[PDB]
Amino acid sequence: SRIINHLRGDPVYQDNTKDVSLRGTFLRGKYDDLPTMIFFTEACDLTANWIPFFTNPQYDILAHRNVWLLNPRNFGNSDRHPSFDLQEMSDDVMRFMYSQKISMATLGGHGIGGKIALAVGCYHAERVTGVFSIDSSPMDQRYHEAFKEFKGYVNALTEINFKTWSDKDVKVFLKENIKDPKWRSIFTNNISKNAKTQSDSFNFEINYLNHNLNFNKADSLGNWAVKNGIYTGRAHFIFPEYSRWVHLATNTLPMHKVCARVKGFGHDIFYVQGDENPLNHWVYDFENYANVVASKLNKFLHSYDGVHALLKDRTEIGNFMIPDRIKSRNDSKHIYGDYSPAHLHHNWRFNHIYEKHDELDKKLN
Amino acid sequence: SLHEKMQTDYLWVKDHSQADSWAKARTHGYNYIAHTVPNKKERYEMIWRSMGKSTDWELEKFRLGKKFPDRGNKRRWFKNLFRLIKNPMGYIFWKTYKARLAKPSLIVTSMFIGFTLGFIKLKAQSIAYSKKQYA
Amino acid sequence: GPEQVSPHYESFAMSRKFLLTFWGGFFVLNFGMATVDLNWIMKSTYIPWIFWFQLMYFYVEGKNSMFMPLLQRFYRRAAANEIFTMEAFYHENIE
């Protein structure tokens, strides 16, 4: 109605990787002008599963920012393209931010969606305030057992031919092949019937995804290439204590390797205290995991997101002076000294708040 | 078309009004490179990506243009020397903070002090013997 | 020979820092006790130490913040870093 607004479109198969438009759900915040957050769900996962998380009055996330539950290419409602390059998918978000008139946004992700969110900060750091990654890390996960199961489920899902198979044939095939209960439920909800009861099909492009996973090479979604580079902004990582995707022993090192400003464990990298359970990857289903993720997310958005690198928190905005490098300013008659870095309005490009406040400033003087 | 639509749009690619006054990093990062870090190759990608944005990925403009050093690092060795003279213990404290987070045992710390002061004591006895040879 | 893969949980240097420090200083003392004219070697090394460092300072370090950058060696790193990526994506490009 008002808070939940998902723009309706039809996926278009595109030959050019630049003519790709992303669709998703928009969640309006409680207050008038708030920065926006763009969040990516796990690969082949519904955006609607995160709606109760982002609209929970106890967590009160919308009090901080507007949330875009956006689908990547070949997923859900967005356009389809055979390439899964993280740079090409990152440029999709920039065209989405432009068409939606968003100057800069916070990026979030779950699982593989965490890699996608962090990749956008790697390729467009000036348009991204921060990255909040849930149960993911910028590392090659092609050989993790959790990814192999997901890779195996997508491969088995290519066997089903929707024209010949009946509905009862599909239900039996999924229960027997997909043993994970959550992956089974997610894949069933991705099945949808086209207009005029033409046939059934998965919402995500099963052909393009299977070739990406089955090939198991550098462009796979499980892999993180060196080509992606380094993210220079604020990054926060949260994952379960016993997670099949992020192992606390060594899978934290990629975060320091890719993110330049990560301080370490206990500051930007936390683990949710929990038991061994293969379903603990889906933090929004369990209140214990969801409460900790939401509190850490509120702390990131409130005090650490979109703050200059050399400032500690948002509390230092306007009272902490950063040293300046010599011969860095165009003015020749400039006395070099410490300064407080400029923080800009979240959508200053598409509004005239700086022009309006200039005129109000002249009325004072 | 939408891709070229936003590349031409002035609102999308436009410096802020105060951008001229701000401190500007006048290097792409090729002047001082991190050689032994595990993310060394990822650093080079960002340098290459920064050089490409400056020339719209027409690197012939960079080849013909002027190349400049990192002028922000000028006289940096002098400035650290004067800060050490100003407050030597405060300079040494913060420059060694992260290293001192791992503290060795009392034995190792005692051996450091014991062998250091012992070497200084023998140095003083060698100086006093040189005055004996001069006499 | 083959790559000397260590099967251990920690590297050899960090596990034997105290021991390697002993043998490190043993050979320093060994050379120090053996070299009775060590002061003659220190003085004989002063002139070349000053000369070669002042002569090659700009070409090694001074160029990074003074007159010319001399980015020839960086261009060789940047090209090789791009080839490293092309080889990593060989299967994709050929497919």
């Binding site: 390059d85 462009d219 | 490409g52 719209d56 990925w57 027409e58 690197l59 080849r63 | 990593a88 994506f89």
Partner: peptide
């Protein structure tokens, strides 16, 4: 996959390629 991003990759002083 990966493509050369430098548009002047095949430029020489005598012409293209």
């Amino acid at each position: 996959g990966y493509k050369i991003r430098n548009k002047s990759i095949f430029w020489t002083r005598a012409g293209w390629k």
